[PDB]
Amino acid sequence: SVQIVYKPVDLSKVTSKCGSLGNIHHKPGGGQVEVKSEKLDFKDRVQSKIGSLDNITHVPGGGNKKIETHKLTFR
Amino acid sequence: SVQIVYKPVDLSKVTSKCGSLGNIHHKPGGGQVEVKSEKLDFKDRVQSKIGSLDNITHVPGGGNKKIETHKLTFR
Amino acid sequence: SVQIVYKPVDLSKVTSKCGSLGNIHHKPGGGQVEVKSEKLDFKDRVQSKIGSLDNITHVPGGGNKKIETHKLTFR
Amino acid sequence: SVQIVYKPVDLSKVTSKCGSLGNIHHKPGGGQVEVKSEKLDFKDRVQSKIGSLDNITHVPGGGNKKIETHKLTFR
Amino acid sequence: SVQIVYKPVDLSKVTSKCGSLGNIHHKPGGGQVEVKSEKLDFKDRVQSKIGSLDNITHVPGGGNKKIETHKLTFR
C-alpha cells in the first residue's frame, strides 16, 4: 500500500576555466607597531596579540564547491 | 493506495571563463600604530589585538558554488 | 506493504582548468614591533603573542570540493 | 698655446619600479590558412612564407636604455 | 704647445626593480594550414617556409642596456 520511489537524477556540472592566474601581492603589517605600558592592573584573564597574525593568502586554481543533501524520513 | 514517485532531474551547469586573472595588491596596515597606556585598572577579562590581523586575499580562478537540498518527509 | 526504493543517481562533475598559476608574494610583519612594559600586575591567566604568527599562504592547483550527504530514517 | 680640457661629468640615473608585471597573452594566427594554387609560372626567384612567422613577445622587467657618445676631433 | 686633456667622468646608473614578472603565454600558429599546389613551373631559385617559424618569447628580469662610445682623433 505504502510505496515510496526516491529517484533523484543529477547530470550537472560546476566548471571553471582560467587562462592565467597570478601576480598576487599580500603585504600586511608593513608599518611600525609600538606598545608602551606603565602601571596596569589586571584581576582576571588576559589575552594579547601584537604584530601580524592570522593573515591569509588563498589562491585556488579552481575553488569550485558543490554541496548536496538528500534526506528521506518515514514515520 | 499511497504511491509517491520522487524524480527530480537536473542537467544544469554553473560555468565561468576568465582569459586572465591577476595583478592583485593587498596592503593592510601600512601606517604607524602607537599605543601608550598609563594607570589602567581591569577587574574582568581583557582581550586585545594590536597591528595587522585576520587580513585575507582570496583569489579563486573559479569560485563557483552549487548548493542543492532534497527532503522527503512522510508521516 | 511498506516498500522503500532509494535510488539516487549522480553523474555530475566539478572541474577546473588553469593555464598558469603563480607569482604569489605574501609578506606579513615587515615592520618593527616594540613592546615596553613597566610595573604590570596580573592576578589571573595570561596569554601573549608578539610578532608574526599563524600566517598562511594556501595555493592549490585545484581546490575543488564536493560534499554529499545521504540519510534514510525509518521508524 | 692650444690647450683643450674635455671634462664631461655625468651623475645621472635612468630608473624604473614596477610592483607587478604579468598576465600577458599573445595568440597570433589562430585562424585557418588555405592556399590553393593551379597553373602558376615563375621565371625568376620566389620567396614564400605561409602560417605564423616572426611573432615576438618581449617582456623586460626593466627595458631601460642609455646611449652616450663622446667625440673630440682636432685637426 | 698642443695639450689635450680628455677626462670624461661617469657615475651614472641604469636600474630596474620588478616585484613579480610572469604568467606570459605565447601561442603562435594555433590554426590549420593547408597548402595545395598543382602544375607549378619554377625556372629560378625557390625559398619556402610553411607552419610556425622564428617565433620568439623573450622575458628578461632586467633587460637594461648601456651603450657608451669615446673617440679622440688627432691629425
UniProtKB/Swiss-Prot annotation, chains A, B, C, D, E:
Changing residue 16 to F: In PIDB; markedly reduced ability of tau to promote microtubule assembly. It comes from the Eukaryota. Changing residue 65 to I: In PIDB; 90% reduction in the rate of microtubule assembly. The modification N6,N6-dimethyllysine is found at residue 7. It is found in: Cytoplasm, Cytosol; Cell membrane; Cytoplasm, Cytoskeleton; Cell projection, Axon. There is a cross-link at residues 7, 13, 17, 27, 39, 43, 49, 65, 71 (Glycyl lysine isopeptide (Lys-Gly) (interchain with G-Cter in ubiquitin)). The modification N6-acetyllysine is found at residues 7, 13, 17, 27, 39, 43, 65. Expressed in neurons. Isoform PNS-tau is expressed in the peripheral nervous system while the others are expressed in the central nervous system. The modification Phosphoserine is found at residues 1, 20, 48, 52. Tau/MAP repeats lie at residues 2-32, 33-64. Glycans are attached at residues 43, 49, 65. The record marks 7, 13, 17, 27, 36, 39, 66, 71 as: Not glycated. Phosphorylation at serine and threonine residues in S-P or T-P motifs by proline-directed protein kinases (PDPK1, CDK1, CDK5, GSK3, MAPK) (only 2-3 sites per protein in interphase, seven-fold increase in mitosis, and in the form associated with paired helical filaments (PHF-tau)), and at serine residues in K-X-G-S motifs by MAP/microtubule affinity-regulating kinase (MARK1, MARK2, MARK3 or MARK4), causing detachment from microtubules, and their disassembly. Phosphorylation decreases with age. The modification Omega-N-methylarginine is found at residue 45. The tau/MAP repeat binds to tubulin. Type I isoforms contain 3 repeats while type II isoforms contain 4 repeats. It is linked to In Alzheimer disease, the neuronal cytoskeleton in the brain is progressively disrupted and replaced by tangles of paired helical filaments (PHF) and straight filaments, mainly composed of hyperphosphorylated forms of TAU (PHF-TAU or AD P-TAU). O-GlcNAcylation is greatly reduced in Alzheimer disease brain cerebral cortex leading to an increase in TAU/MAPT phosphorylations. Interacts with MARK1, MARK2, MARK3 and MARK4. Interacts with PSMC2 through SQSTM1. Interacts with SQSTM1 when polyubiquitinated. Interacts with FKBP4. Binds to CSNK1D. Interacts with SGK1. Interacts with PIN1. Interacts with LRRK2. Interacts with LRP1, leading to endocytosis; this interaction is reduced in the presence of LRPAP1/RAP. Promotes microtubule assembly and stability, and might be involved in the establishment and maintenance of neuronal polarity. The C-terminus binds axonal microtubules while the N-terminus binds neural plasma membrane components, suggesting that tau functions as a linker protein between both. Axonal polarity is predetermined by TAU/MAPT localization (in the neuronal cell) in the domain of the cell body defined by the centrosome. The short isoforms allow plasticity of the cytoskeleton whereas the longer isoforms may preferentially play a role in its stabilization. This is Microtubule-associated protein tau. The chain holds residues 622 to 696 of 758 of the full protein.
